[PDB]
Amino acid sequence: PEMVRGQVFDVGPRYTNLSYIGEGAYGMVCSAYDNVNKVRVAIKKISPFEHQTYCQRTLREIKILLAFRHENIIGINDIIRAPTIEQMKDVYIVQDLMETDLYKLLKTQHLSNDHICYFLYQILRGLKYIHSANVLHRDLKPSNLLLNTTCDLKICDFGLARVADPDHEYVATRWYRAPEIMLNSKGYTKSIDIWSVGCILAEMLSNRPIFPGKHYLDQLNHILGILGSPSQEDLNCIINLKARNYLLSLPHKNKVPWNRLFPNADSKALDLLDKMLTFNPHKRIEVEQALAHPYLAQYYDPSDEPIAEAPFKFDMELDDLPKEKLKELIFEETARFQPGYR
């Protein structure tokens, strides 16, 4: 088989010419050539079987991506793994090849207001479909927005996605986490994705993350430094009046108007930004509302903005199964890409 940076990529003979693209903790991503279909694809080797959390993440991403059909959401073209459970040590997910992501792009490229507007419409368009299935993505951030030079945007990486439930784990970055998650919320509400989207928008507008905290309390300090100290009702809407004490310990800070940051931004983008980054999740703009905001009027089209057929449902609680069970589920979930499955 082919070896990429010292690792087996056992995807032949159908897939060949693997070129390394990128890396995460238990997964590597390569470009490749599909000789059966004669297209360039992306292949993710994922080796999650050592840890429960990775297993559960992998199963969520698989089930959701196979259940969703949307222009603005990455799909899964094929999945390769061994023919017995004992041999299965890795899983390869074949996806459409995208050219870059928003994170890698913003590194080297000032966006124009036109691109910003159109990228945001695309995110929210994908998100509408997501939320309409009653799914929360929960990890929206630039590195999860895949793009082409044609300016198509696809949302990827649903390892932390769940079914919304107000109200009867965690993450690389807190940078795009809604304030309520540090306070009183499990992030089981659709408002958390909206906050992430606002964070993303702010980052396209200025090429830098708006709230780059280094740890839990610092993340809050960044957020409040812009949004200003919260109102007593935004307070004690709390499910926790004992981290609220911590809030009280902080000096009052004023709301730094959005035109002082982002002085050149379009007034309508800034206005939509204000509505997406509101401290109170209940006062926070929803996906349909945001799509309908005047900033996105040119692209706004309910008739060409698809909605899920039904709510998604897991059927088993994944968080709570041992990795052995989860491995077995992963095996049965991928059997449909095996030759001779019935």
Partner: peptide, 16 residues
């Protein structure tokens, strides 16, 4: 990395 116009996208295309 350098972006072509919006008008390239097929989604954007069905906006005309």
């Amino acid at each position: 990395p350098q972006l072509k116009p919006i008008e390239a996208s097929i989604l954007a295309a069905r906006r005309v």
